[PDB]
Amino acid sequence: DIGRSSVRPYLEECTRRFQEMFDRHVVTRPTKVELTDAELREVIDDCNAAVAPLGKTVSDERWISYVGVVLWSQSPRHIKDMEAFKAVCVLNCVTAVWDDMDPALHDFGLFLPQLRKICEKYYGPEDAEVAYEAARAFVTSDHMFRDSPIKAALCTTSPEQYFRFRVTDIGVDFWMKMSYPIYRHPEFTEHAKTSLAARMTTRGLTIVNDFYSYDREVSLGQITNCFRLCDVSDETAFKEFFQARLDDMIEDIECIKAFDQLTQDVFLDLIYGNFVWTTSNKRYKTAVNDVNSRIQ
Amino acid sequence: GRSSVRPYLEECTRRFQEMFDRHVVTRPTKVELTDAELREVIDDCNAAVAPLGKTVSDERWISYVGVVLWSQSPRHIKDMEAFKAVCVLNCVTAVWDDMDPALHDFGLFLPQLRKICEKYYGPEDAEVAYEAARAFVTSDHMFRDSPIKAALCTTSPEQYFRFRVTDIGVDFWMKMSYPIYRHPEFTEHAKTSLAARMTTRGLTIVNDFYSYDREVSLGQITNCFRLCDVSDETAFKEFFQARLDDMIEDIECIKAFDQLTQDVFLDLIYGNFVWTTSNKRYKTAVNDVNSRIQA
Ligand SMILES: [Cl-]
Ligand SMILES: [Cl-]
Ligand SMILES: [Mg+2]
Ligand SMILES: [Mg+2]
Ligand SMILES: [Mg+2]
Ligand SMILES: [Mg+2]
Ligand SMILES: [Mg+2]
Ligand SMILES: [Mg+2]
């Protein structure tokens, strides 16, 4: 129970083992994108404008905590479109607010038009439609699976059922479909649109996020977390589960290395950069705080 | 030795059927097209593949189209124009799947896919259907001799079925079939591809078993039974049971979806099995309705 309410006893060791895995299997360190003050302010003002119809104010410190995943987990050496980068910054942030909101305040009529306005600001006409549909599908999925029997079944049955749910629910399909304009790389664009890009990266993103967001999520009655599949109060069982998940991440990373050079660079910067950001995000460091609290 | 699953044909067919009777129960049913409807479908198919220069016989079309007739969910059909579109799109992209890639002319074929979608679908639905068709034929082409395909199909079942979510065409299927039903929940699962991911393994394991002999003889590697030594009876049976286990788990989780959506999901998997066991394409290594379409 309370023994199952936290992965704190494993925090240091799992962090060390995560990093050791990346040093061995990815090697290349992720890179932080440095926005100018003008760029950061533009992103944040677009974020505020988009969530203002929903009546909640979001502090700069909160936005900065949301945006760090984009700053850390894109692929700076391959960036060609900084407008598409800023779009991903904004879209990520405003839908992370949605992910944190009480569903009672999920106003599709007010929010969906703001998502379209973002896409139309930053993307060409064709890209705007691809990014928008993926944003729409992400916020719709997050809404419709709150207290759903489907989510309960897919999250409590097996790791295979759980990660299949997370391809969409964690947002990585959305991410790939709004991020391919950053790179203008033909192969990457196709893997993004088939969702093979998302499926290749789902476990490495999800396992890392689930470990560090476990304590917050169980305190909030949130069940979408693979470590609820094991008794985290049982050290031996946890260790076995955790090794199985490292094995999952490793197999994925090695198969990702079969993709073309630019595509695998982007895929691996995403997985490894998310890890680096996750270990520095105060959202993931106490059960409830001013940057991870539920938005009432 | 590993060239054939023929020794297991009878047992595996019986066990598939037993599994379905225990876990699905509800039988699929065949859509009966009128003569005019079937002729409209076949005319559109021929018109679409005509620019590619290879004639396709009525018998071959009827072979391709059976999967749509058997694997939709007739109780819930509301839009027979969308149904006919799925018939045409399935068949013409099946021809593409059988073609030598030297014959893959995107500039001639892609506008034929758009013309089909624009005939049968509303404007939003036509874009969704067309994008999925484009994605399907581009994937089939770009993976024909790709190291990515080798890596995903030789590493583990997990990597293989991940590749099949697109390659077998099921994501395509869901995104062009939701208009048949106009069921709001089904439409969203189609668009997230959750629908496709729930049904991939039950469709792929069946198709792989019955297309193994043909595929191995053409040097096609996209088949999960190449992950086991099919010449080792003990190893095969262990592998085959693990695949039955996968289908069973998927089906039991599908039953958590809403009633109509799960009817559609399970009719797809079980109807595909019914059609596969009566399609002559899946009965010899090469015959006149499964031969490679070479240049
Ligand atoms: Cl949750
Ligand atoms: Cl193949
Ligand atoms: Mg979430
Ligand atoms: Mg969350
Ligand atoms: Mg989380
Ligand atoms: Mg194929
Ligand atoms: Mg084939
Ligand atoms: Mg096959």
Swiss-Prot record, chain A:
Q: How is the cofactor bound?
A: Binds 3 Mg(2+) ions per subunit.
Q: Where does Mg(2+) 2 bind?
A: D99
Impact upon substituting D99E? No change in product (cyclooctat-9-en-7-ol)
Which segments cross the bilayer?
Answer: none
Q: Which UniProt keywords apply?
A: Isomerase, Lyase, Magnesium, Metal-binding
Q: Which cofactor does it need?
A: Mg(2+)
**Where, in this chain's numbering, is Mg(2+) 1 bound?**
D99
Q: Motif span (DDXXD motif)?
A: 99-102
Subunit structure, briefly?
Homodimer.
Any miscellaneous information on file?
Answer: 3,7,18-dolabellatriene produced by the Trp288Gly mutant has potential antibiotic activity against multidrug-resistant S.aureus (MRSA).
What's this protein's name?
Cyclooctat-9-en-7-ol synthase
Species this chain originates from: Streptomyces melanosporofaciens
Name the gene behind this protein: CotB2
From Swiss-Prot, chain B:
Q: Mind listing the UniProt keywords for this protein, alphabetically?
A: Isomerase, Lyase, Magnesium, Metal-binding
Q: Where does Mg(2+) 2 bind?
A: D97
Q: Which domain of life is it from?
A: Bacteria
Among the GO molecular function terms of this UniProt record, one is: metal ion binding
Note the Pfam families from the entry: Terpene_syn_C_2
- Which cysteine pairs are joined by S-S bonds? none
Q: Catalysed reaction per UniProt?
A: geranylgeranyl diphosphate + H2O = cyclooctat-9-en-7-ol + diphosphate
Positions with a binding annotation for Mg(2+) 1: D97
According to the record, mutating W275G results in: Produces 3,7,18-dolabellatriene
Q: Where is this motif: NSE/DTE motif?
A: 207-215
Identify which cofactors the protein needs according to its UniProt entry.
Answer: Mg(2+)
EC number(s) stated in the UniProt entry for this protein: 4.2.3.146
Motif DDXXD motif, residue range(s) on this chain: 97-100
Q: How is the cofactor bound?
A: Binds 3 Mg(2+) ions per subunit.
| SUPFAM superfamilies (alphabetical) | Terpenoid synthases
Which EC class is this protein assigned?
lyase
For the ligand (Mg(2+) 3), the binding residues are N207, S211, E215
Record Gene3D superfamilies:
Farnesyl Diphosphate Synthase (1.10.600.10)
Which family is it part of?
Belongs to the terpene synthase family.
The job of this chain, per UniProt, is described as: Catalyzes the cyclization of the linear isoprenoid intermediate geranylgeranyl diphosphate to tricycclic cyclooctat-9-en-7-ol in the cyclooctatin biosynthesis pathway. Cyclooctatin is a potent inhibitor of lysophospholipase.
Q: What else is known?
A: 3,7,18-dolabellatriene produced by the Trp288Gly mutant has potential antibiotic activity against multidrug-resistant S.aureus (MRSA).
Assembly and partners are described as: Homodimer.
Q: What is known of its domains?
A: The Asp-Asp-Xaa-Xaa-Asp/Glu(DDXXD/E) motifs is important for the catalytic activity, presumably through binding to Mg(2+).
Protein name stated in the entry = Cyclooctat-9-en-7-ol synthase
Q: Which gene encodes it?
A: CotB2
